[PDB]
């Protein structure tokens, strides 16, 4: 995985997310200072089916294609998101994902909220129900 610096006025990106949004302002920024930044290329797999989802990829630009499994496939483009299933199943995903374009994702994972999102009782209370 890559783990390079992010551009700047990612916050509206990641609070993009309803749960996100939902976070206080200071877990958000704590998601910022943690977030990695990952560049794809055309053809590449960002997830695949099968293997253990928990984390979330925020499109800063390019198109990309998810197909979940027996379900109808759905494409994204620049400033939507991809990973709500990822988080959602703790286990391994019923579904993957590839880059159609050349684009550019924002990363952040359940490592980093265990870091982020409990790192205040309040909001483990909160997160012991996010899945």
Known sequence: ??????????????????????ADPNFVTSMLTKLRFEVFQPGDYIIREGTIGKKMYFIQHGVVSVLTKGNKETKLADGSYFGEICLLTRGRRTASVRADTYCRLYSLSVDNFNEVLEEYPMMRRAFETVA
């Not at 783990?3 to 993009?16: D, P």
């Open 1 to 22: 995985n890559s783990e390079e610096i992010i551009n700047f006025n990612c916050r509206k990106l990641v609070a993009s997310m309803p749960l996100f949004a939902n």
